[PDB]
Amino acid sequence: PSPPLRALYESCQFFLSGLERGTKRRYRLDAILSLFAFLGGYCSLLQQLRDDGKQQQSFLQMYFQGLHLYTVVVYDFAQGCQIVDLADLTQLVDSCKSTVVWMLEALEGLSGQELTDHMGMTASYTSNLAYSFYSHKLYAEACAISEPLCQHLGLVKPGTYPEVPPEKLHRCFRLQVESLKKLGKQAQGCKMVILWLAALQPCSPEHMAEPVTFWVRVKMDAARAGDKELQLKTLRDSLSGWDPETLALLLREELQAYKAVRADTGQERFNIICDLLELSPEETPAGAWARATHLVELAQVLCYHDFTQQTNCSALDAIREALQLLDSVRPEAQARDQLLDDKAQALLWLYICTLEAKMQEGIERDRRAQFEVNDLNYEDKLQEDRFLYSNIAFNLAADAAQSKCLDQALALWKELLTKGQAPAVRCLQQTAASLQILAALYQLVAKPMQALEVLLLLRIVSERLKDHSKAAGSSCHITQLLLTLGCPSYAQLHLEEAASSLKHLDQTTDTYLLLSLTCDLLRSQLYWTHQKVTKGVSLLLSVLRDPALQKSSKAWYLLRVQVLQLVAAYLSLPSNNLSHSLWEQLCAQGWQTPEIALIDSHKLLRSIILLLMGSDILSTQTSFLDYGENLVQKWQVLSEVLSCSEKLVCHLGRLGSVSEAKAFCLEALKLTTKLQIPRQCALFLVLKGELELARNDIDLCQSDLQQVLFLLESCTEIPNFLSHSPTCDCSLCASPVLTAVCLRWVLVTAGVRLAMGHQAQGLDLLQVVLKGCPEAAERLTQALQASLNHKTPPSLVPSLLDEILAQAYTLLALEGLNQPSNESLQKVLQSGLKFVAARIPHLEPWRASLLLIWALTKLGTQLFASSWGWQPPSTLDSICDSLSVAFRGISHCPPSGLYAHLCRFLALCLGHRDPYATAFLVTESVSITCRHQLLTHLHRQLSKAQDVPLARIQRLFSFRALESGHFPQPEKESFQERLALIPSGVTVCVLALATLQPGTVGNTLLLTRLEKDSPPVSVQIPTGQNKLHLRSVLNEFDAIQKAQKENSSCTDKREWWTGRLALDHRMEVLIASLEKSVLGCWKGLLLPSSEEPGPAQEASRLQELLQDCGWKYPDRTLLKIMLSGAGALTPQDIQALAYGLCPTQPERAQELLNEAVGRLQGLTVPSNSHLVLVLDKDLQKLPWESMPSLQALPVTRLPSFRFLLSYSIIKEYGASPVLSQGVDPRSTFYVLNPHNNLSSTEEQFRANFSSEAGWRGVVGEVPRPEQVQEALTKHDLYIYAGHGAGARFLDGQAVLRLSCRAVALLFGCSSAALAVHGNLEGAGIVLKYIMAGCPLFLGNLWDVTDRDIDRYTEALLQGWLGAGPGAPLLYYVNQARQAPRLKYLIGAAPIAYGLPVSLR
Ligand SMILES: [Zn+2]
């Protein structure tokens, strides 16, 4: 009784002493006995509460303390639970559940204060027990121990549990809801969430956020599980008789939660918005406000999903209704900050929906909208299409109205956010996201400065929202945009702000790593612009080797794209910077030239865009899944694609490849046509005009310029923009992109005028361009100063404006050469040289061009005649040094036209003083564009791979595979290593034309003979001093071709035949003039040497005497080569040699040479050998093979010297089977009469091609690409007799993809001919065939009139196919030229490309 109760105090003291002894002592199984003792004490406490009648508060506090001690002991036990004590924790939790039921009963009738104190202690004990149980994964036990609490909690009216701790209430509720979700209680979890909401009802909605989030989570789990009844059981029906305003707020919060989740939620949001519309009234301006907000949300939902049938409303109609409602609303002073940014969101989504409608309409419009003799210009015609009228259907004046919405939204948001006071908008998150989308859209439409304004505002929001990741992201974007414009200094402050803000994040999230990598990449870029390349390479290498760059995610892909662009920027630097050690480290990654990196970046961008919006946008032949960041990323990817295309087009146009540049330009034009943006269209049209100018197509360029003028006059809401003042605010002057387009327009117009011969107008226009560029730069500087407000004009602002000025200076100086008398522009060379010298590693090719102009100006002939040893019967030091420093500038990536001029001019200057250097320079000036294309093709093959022959071929062709030092020590070392690799018994001859004027054809021929174990031999032949110049021969050849075309179209055949005979006589005269008037006595350099001893002895003896005779440079090899053919030497050529080499005592030299020829007469036996001819773009047209002296030798022509070495490498690695085993006359595929325009050819060649062995053929129709595919890859002999080479079926790009393993006999009109458009190098299918690795290629050089090509084909085929086991094809090729009636008109057409090929 009372004494026992008094003893119960002593018992409690003893229990406290035991607990002190049991402190940190896990009772384990003895916890059960402790709980039994506690249950006895609880019975005693019930008896005391009966006796209590702080009468009972003291006993309640004692019981609470005992329960707290028991809870602490159970928490320790669960901390040391492991596998076993969990079972003991079950009994402990049963006892604790009995105690919790007792505590809940005691908490009843707690009146006040204790109702928040005793119930608070009960809640704390329950929370501790629940944490211990749930942490032990005892979901069922925790649910059982927590069921009594929330059940009565939720059931009780709002008065109960008043002002209870929301966190404590959340803690139990969150634990129970999480346990239900993990167990998948489904309905039970939803009802518990309902009780959670009911209990917390009298409070502000931020406390309701977590329940709502849990409701959305459980609903979406039901969604993955296929449940829909829960989704039907929405908040409206669930909450039932609740206050409508709270229900509307809860539905809005649920809508935002559904926007957050990463799943497709179109229908759920539609249901929520419809329910919001039903709840809202339409008799109160607050109702109008709610209706407008719901309408803009409905517009967001409908702008991407198709729900028209069940809504009977369009996005535009809904958004216009919302706009009218918003404009009608009269606000209240405290809530104006919501009407602002409500209007802004509405206008922005209006713009987005109108753009989407335009895109869909254009896609549908474009989708439903859908026999010349030579095929030289087939790919050009195929590339070109008719879409210029679409541009007229493109520049509608609705664009100003469309952009007005975005401008007004920006203005309203600026007014909202500028003021210092914290914004009162309910959700700043959505404002920040919409600001990001607006900035992306502004970038996409080529309005950069306005986009920067938005980004500054986004950072302001990040500070208010205290979210550190977005501050770093926005600062990185700001720095990237600032550097793209060309302001180096203003990038650094924002970069440092990003670096400072980066620190406040956990160092394990992907965000931290991505931001750190981006900042390091930006630092590397900033070093590149500030001449710190040495550590920039280190930073770039550390970024590249980092394994986290390869993680599969869309955010990392854009970082990879930017890294690739920076790699391309680094790969465009002269070898003086860095060092040898870092160069192969950089090249070891797998990118050897900037264009390779740019192409990889473009491919990555296309792959990214493929994953986001399908593929209908890019080309004509899924769902968007708006997810948050996807909306921003779409516009970002489109803008990046456009910028990458612009860079690629500019670089490829500069290099000298025009076909690829035109392809990229047309693709970009199509893309800009679909989106309906005139500003980008104008820039790409101007670039296309510039590309067309280089091909000499004046009218097409003029049409494109007219289109540019029409578009410029369309958006401006002799052209008028030339008269603008230096300072202006018009749309053309306010924006830098438009200013760049306008400045390019005048350059292209001046180029066209100069081409047409209208001089003195092009100079006038180019003066305008030169004057205009710096003033535009200064206006851009002022504009950037106003926006960013640092109030300090930042250093310099280099940009694309610099390149425009450089090219303008180049063209002005080049025009200066042709008119030497005008002093006013004779200082432009100096001015441009100073201007370029300022930016050394940025305008190097332009510096090289200006230096070449300076050298040719100082040229003022016999000036180069003291370096060679044959004269036809110090300034040099300065020219050599200047040309050397110009050569080292562009060696790493030379333009295809300036390199040849530099190389051949320097080779002329050096002369026989350094034979090795002269030979290297002459060899390094032929077929450079082919070398670039082969490097790109090799990279494509190697990338397809995931090899050793490919690696060695890459080393042989790379521009940087050499050591360091002076000029030309590494060049000579590499050249000697190449020379040691020459196959035996092969003599290589290079014929190139030395051009003085960099636009015309010269009159100097350079000849080089390269041989194994022999020093190189070089010589120069001037042809301007004698009649019958080289240009005379070229003009006569062109005249003969045009006369043949004229004579082809006639009716009477008498005149036809007479004209044909006269033309044949003219061609014979031309062929004779080639040998007897151009080469002269030096025909012997193209003949095989001698192996019998005795010519060497005679050469040595003659050398000793001729040294005294007056030979300025004595060479034994020259005499050996000339005397190896002593039999064919005529008296006149002997006189020419003696007079040229020996001007001191010509008479004695003539006598000695005559005696030497007499001694060597007869005892000459030239033997097996092979000659390779390397010709430049102008000499390739002439038939060198049909000279009388060369009509007895095997001759083939190759694009360059490195190709022979590549053939040797392939033969050593045993890839090519033809040059190892021999063309087998069993695998033949012939194409006869694709389109039936020929009749007699079929009749003649049908039987001759039918009755054979293994001759698969197709005759009558056009072969499908698969057949020719397998006929070129797998067969051995491919023959085509149709008109043209066949580019209609197998275009060059299809050929490049293959491996060529056959010999192609193309018997068509101009099959082997290379098209020379302007100053560009030759282009043809033969080049692609050689790139694919063709052992031999045969084709005609000029157009043929048929009926004699028949006889030539018959003779050649019969002879070579009936030869026998094995014979050289070149012998029968030379023997078959006598069959036709016209021996020089049709017999001289065929030529051979490749290496000699024989049968088994
Ligand atoms: Zn203006």
Swiss-Prot record:
Residues 1225-1320 form the Peptidase C50 domain. The keyword Transmembrane does not apply. Autocleaves. This function, which is not essential for its protease activity, is unknown. Phosphorylated by CDK1. There are 8 Ser/Thr phosphorylation sites. It is an enzyme of class 3 (hydrolase). It catalyses: All bonds known to be hydrolyzed by this endopeptidase have arginine in P1 and an acidic residue in P4. P6 is often occupied by an acidic residue or by a hydroxy-amino-acid residue, the phosphorylation of which enhances cleavage. It is found in: Cytoplasm; Nucleus. GO terms for molecular function: catalytic activity; cysteine-type endopeptidase activity; cysteine-type peptidase activity. The keyword Glycoprotein does not apply. Regulated by at least two independent mechanisms. First, it is inactivated via its interaction with securin/PTTG1, which probably covers its active site. The association with PTTG1 is not only inhibitory, since PTTG1 is also required for activating it, the enzyme being inactive in cells in which PTTG1 is absent. PTTG1 degradation at anaphase, liberates it and triggers RAD21 cleavage. The complete phosphorylation during mitosis, is removed when cells undergo anaphase. One of its GO terms (biological process) is mitotic sister chromatid segregation. It comes from the Eukaryota. The active site is at 1309. Its EC number is 3.4.22.49. Keywords: Autocatalytic cleavage, Chromosome partition, Cytoplasm, Hydrolase, Nucleus, Phosphoprotein, Protease, Thiol protease. One of its GO terms (cellular component) is centrosome. Interacts with PTTG1. Interacts with RAD21. Caspase-like protease, which plays a central role in the chromosome segregation by cleaving the SCC1/RAD21 subunit of the cohesin complex at the onset of anaphase. During most of the cell cycle, it is inactivated by different mechanisms. This is Separin. It comes from Homo sapiens (Human). The lineage of its organism: Eukaryota, Metazoa, Chordata, Craniata, Vertebrata. The gene is ESPL1. The chain holds residues 329 to 2120 of 2120 of the full protein.
